[PDB]
Design a protein around this ligand. Structure first.
Ligand SMILES: O=c1[nH]c(=O)n([C@H]2C[C@H](O)[C@@H](COP(=O)(O)O)O2)cc1/C=C/Br
Ligand SMILES: O=c1[nH]c(=O)n([C@H]2C[C@H](O)[C@@H](COP(=O)(O)O)O2)cc1/C=C/Br
Ligand SMILES: [Mg+2]
Ligand SMILES: [Mg+2]
Ligand SMILES: [Mg+2]
Ligand SMILES: [Mg+2]
Lengths: 194, 194
């Protein structure tokens, strides 16, 4: 009866792309980089790997470093929108996020980041998983174009959240975008209500 | 098409009850304790809180301590069963576990414990969530009798995994138990296959 919305973290709430680029440039000032306007494809590591030898591994070392996830800046409007969204009648919001393979810091920092921006009580709303298809909900707002896993027919509608890496993608027509948190996310939610 | 089984961690794969009791007794040798045979009700903290003043807080300090989750011993047969279960044709296994409120160590140690007993590749199968009702699957094997949350009608059948705290409970008849990993879990899975 309540509408359930899964909201992705990196690329939707947290600015992974901008934080990575800043830290990559600071740590490797003599390496080439990829300006955000030039990002293409979900995987940062793959494009850097295509840019020059051994750059995939250097990219990876940025997000494997302590404080990388914790120090990500929220995206504009994200904290305000999700707070408003959660307070809406008949609306349950979960933050659904995938950790990286190296688990020393990432899960911890993601919990810490949510506490910081949404408060202790919002920690109950976090779902950490590598497979989003096994989480059920009416909506998934997520910047990754290809969301697959163990469940061939997920219950959610995936709404693509715009990011530098996906902004040029033509979606297969039924599919829909949320262009930024300034875009009309209430209209999207309302279209799913009974 | 593949059968999906969610397997809980504490009380099913990891011996939370025995590890807690050992560490509680070692740290508080002059406090009264609850023998496992005498455990009743899911919440360890509540029963200890009923046993004497300020014992809830002392109990909590055990599982909030570093290395508590990491150093839990697997339950008998658990690692062998889950490994066999995951290798079965048309069967996907996820470990579905709730972290405690204090997130400094618990998420990290749970990932570490899974790596230790199941290997790096099994980390992809972990779902960390306070709400299991929003994870979809055919079966949930879990020692907690009362599993509720945002989804009023979860897709899984909850099979109650026997533990000291629940062994005496009469379930509402449709509900079913897995008595230990030596019990016939394949028969339970097979009853759910198309
Ligand atoms: O290029 C990457 N970009 C990225 O976000 N990640 C990681 C970063 C994050 O933990 C998880 C976020 O995915 P979503 O929850 O937003 O879908 O995947 C990993 C790589 C490459 C690893 Br090799
Ligand atoms: O008494 C408790 N027992 C317990 O397992 N936990 C915590 C321990 C574990 O992180 C999570 C396990 O639940 P399941 O995933 O097995 O369902 O709840 C907390 C308390 C009290 C907190 Br106050
Ligand atoms: Mg993302
Ligand atoms: Mg609400
Ligand atoms: Mg349990
Ligand atoms: Mg299998």
């Amino acid at each position: 009866r309540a509408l359930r919305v899964l909201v992705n973290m990196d690329g939707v709430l947290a600015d992974f792309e901008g934080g990575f680029l800043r830290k990559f440039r600071a740590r490797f000032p003599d390496q080439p980089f990829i300006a955000l306007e030039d990002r293409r494809g979900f995987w940062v590591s793959e494009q850097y790997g295509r840019l020059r030898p051994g750059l995939s591994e250097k990219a990876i070392s940025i997000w494997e470093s302590k404080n990388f996830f914790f120090e990500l800046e929220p995206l504009p409007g994200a904290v305000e929108a999700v707070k408003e969204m959660a307070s809406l009648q008949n609306t349950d919001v979960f933050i659904c996020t995938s950790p990286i393979k190296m688990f020393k810091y990432c899960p911890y920092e993601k919990y810490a980041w949510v506490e910081k921006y949404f408060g202790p009580d919002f920690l109950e709303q976090i779902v950490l998983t590598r497979d989003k298809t096994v989480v059920s909900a009416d909506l998934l707002i997520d910047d990754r174009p290809d969301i697959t896993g163990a469940e061939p027919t997920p219950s959610w509608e995936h709404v693509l959240f715009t990011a530098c890496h996906n902004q040029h993608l033509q979606l297969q027509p039924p599919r829909r975008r949320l262009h930024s948190w300034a875009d009309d996310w209430k209209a999207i939610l309302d279209s799913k209500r009974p």
